[model samples]
Target: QYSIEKLKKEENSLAKDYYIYRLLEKNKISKKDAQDLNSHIFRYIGKIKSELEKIIPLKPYINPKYAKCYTYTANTILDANLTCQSVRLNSLVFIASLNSKDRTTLAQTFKNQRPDLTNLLLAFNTSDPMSYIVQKEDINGFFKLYNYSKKYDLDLNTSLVNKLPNHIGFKDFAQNIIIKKENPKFRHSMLEINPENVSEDSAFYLGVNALTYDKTELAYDFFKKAAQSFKSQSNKDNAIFWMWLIKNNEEDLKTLSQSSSLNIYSLYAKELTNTPFPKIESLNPSKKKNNFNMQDPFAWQKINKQIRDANASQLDVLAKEFDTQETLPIYAYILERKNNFKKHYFIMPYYDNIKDYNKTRQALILAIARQESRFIPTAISVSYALGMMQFMPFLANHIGEKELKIPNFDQDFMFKPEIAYYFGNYHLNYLESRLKSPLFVAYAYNGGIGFTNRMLARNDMFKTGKFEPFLSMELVPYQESRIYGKKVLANYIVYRHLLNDSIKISDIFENLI
Candidate 1:
């Protein structure tokens, strides 16, 4: 339904890469058409590119400066000593091969053009990871190196302690490391570094630490300072939200409820204030059978991309195409988004298909799906997670084969609504077996069971304390999981509200272990 120009100009993706690759395979498009369609989207999705390269020469990676090769090709390129001239995504070769005795080899070439990966190599890969930490002199870089070290369980080398003076942002990380290392003498030294002195980027984490330790007054002070100093409105909102939480003053709750984004903190404040949530437009039932092939990710990609960049008028136009049970989630997503999150512009979908699930299972599925892919059956994440549940191809295949007892299993089956639901419910059962709390189960889903276990293992999180679940929720070390858990909690509350259980967010947590 779109022109070739729109098709080409549309966002580049693995979907588009496969779309083009299939076009190339079918041998129907002109070479000029091929040239026009050539893209560097492949550089972003190595797995798809790996397949495309096996059949077609990827001209984009041919130029040395473009530096776009996957593991196998990177090895070939490295054999010719072209790795420095040919690497992006740090290349799979960098991930697997190319273990130079020295860590900083070719670190400079990536310094300017690819700053993030540059930091990945130069700063994080260094002997002690201090010089670049000092040079960058920002909270993020310090945290970047800190996160890298922490993930690998890299011990704080006592020698690097001298390099960190009290004045630097690195001292904040040094404080965290010292605390982790259980060094008490400098604990005061590290924690006493002025919140006023720390950059706005550092304020949130530092505030969370104070919050974690039950230093609410000091936490509020840091968040208030952060509320003013953070660059973006979103960060400011987050800081403001945290400030409100620390006090829970009626006026502050109202202020948080008035926040621009439907952020987790605002939702909590809104919950307390009895504010109406993002509008959930009721879906009109349809009798038409949906023969839509959810298995074809390209089809979903085309639909998803169009909706992503559509006007209200275009959404209505496209909304007509999805009129059946299998397609109503797409329709709901379109309507919800057109409302721009004021109304549930996107979370409430998949009405008919989920009818068979019991109330709890239904709530769980919707809560996760709303966060996972906004209920898109053909969804595929950048990491190549397939279908609505956003299962990784490897996981999807394994579950399909081993769990479901399907002989000829494939990831594409995850795109099918029934299969996606079956697998999602199965996986939820598996997660729920380990994590008793729905919030914890949400964490397990997003961050992995091991991550949840690690959090539980720590005394700092989820255990009986001042805040109990709230403190536990806010202090999750994996920021993605932290946010995901909150969003899913919000979603679950809403879903349960609709399902007639009529549970408050607090009530959901009050009875939790």
Candidate 2:
């Protein structure tokens, strides 16, 4: 007997199954396992069909014609063939999804092969080319596979390029189609082929990439060359910072520390030399509240009302409008009182609540929030990290289910302040238990634990006894993670200052010493 509660439970189960199916369709799961899961899903859907109909009105039925096309598309890419079949299927997927840019690119490629079909309406076609209307879901599936392929370095077939009528500018469409070569020598050789053409930033990043593959000496040479050629102060500072790691000198460190640049590298150098943090006055210092405010409390009420009604563009203006340190906190505090957290950049809310999770490392959570999204609860980064803590979907899903025991939540839940802070705090505490140092935890948080471990193990300078915090920070192989560690550490210091705490930068590296 199916009760209403049972149906509701089944619906929830179906959502999880659908999420698993999405993962499978993205090529994250093995084909054999995916097939088995699909079979189970279909069977369960069939069993519930009668009950579902009884609970709700039956909708019009639509037959599925996109399944075979999807399978064909997936197989073509898997086999490394750029056949007409793949193009047709790719076009179908793109057209159905209204991805006109990519669809036009595909159509142009097709027209290059058959100039006669240049006039063909690519969006709508006969049965052979159309393969029925591709489902919106099927279109989404294609993009998922496309993104997954790029992310994991999985080569899709570009053999179809050879078959295209015109080879000119074909490389644009065929980018990432070639298998990625793993050898650092191969990468170095490729870079050497264009040394005269390489930009300063490109060369510097290449050096950082080289370090990931254990070519430290090669990396140092590249950084040295980049330092010589770079025009910008910040870029030059970065190159010098990395070079200092490879060949440490007290003189170079001192020179870098005293340099006029206020970048992360210079700030870190100041710490390495145990200098006080440079005091820069606020851009817009706050003035004390005027006596006019005490007479009428409604003044703040009016200001709060205006802030509450402001949209995103208005919010930006408000931030600038209330630019002074005094007015900014007043506006931010009002927003907090009303739970408008997404725009509260400078204020930390529920600090005590989050601190309870990591009593010893309370400040680190605030630092991460300040750095991650600047306390913006609704923050969504370009890489699709969600909420104040900036968790990627996969990591968020794992933490929600396995750590937080929230079995049925999705990525949307990450935008909620309390939920985001809870998970973010728990994630930091969890990483701290493993790596122990706030520095390493920062590294582990940005890069994975495995990456942090490899970094620590690969170089003696990275290990505790020989570790120089600034040197290790500079030597961190990935440009993103290296810069991330510095920013987080710098933010940590500022957060400590904001919280009225007095911890010297040297104390941060005391563990390393």
What lDDT does the true structure give each of the candidates?
0.64, 0.54
lDDT of 1 at 223: 78
Candidate 2 per-residue lDDT over residues 1-513, each given as its tens digit: 232223223422333333443444344444343332433342345323333334343555433543344443322433433453444554434334433444455556657664323323253333222122122112233233344233322222223212221333222212222112242332333223222333376556556555645566766776777777888666677788878877785776777787655556777788788887765423333653333231122344355457668776677766555544334344454444444432223456545556555333557887777678655555545454776788977999888877678867876577676887788777887898988767788888988899888887764445553325654565566657777777777666665665567576667767653
Model 2 / residue 130 / CA error / Å: 40
Candidate 2 whole-model C-alpha lDDT, 0 to 1: 0.54
Give all TM-scores, in the order shown: 0.66, 0.47
* TM-score (C-alpha) between model 1 and the true structure: 0.66
lDDT value, candidate 1, whole model:
0.64
Number of the top-ranking candidate, with TM-score as the measure: 1
Q: What would the per-residue lDDT of candidate 1 be over residues 360-396, giving only the tens digit for each residue?
A: 7888888898889877777767666767888976678
Candidate 2, after superposition: displacement of residue 117 in Å?
25
Worst 10 residues of 1 by lDDT: 152-161
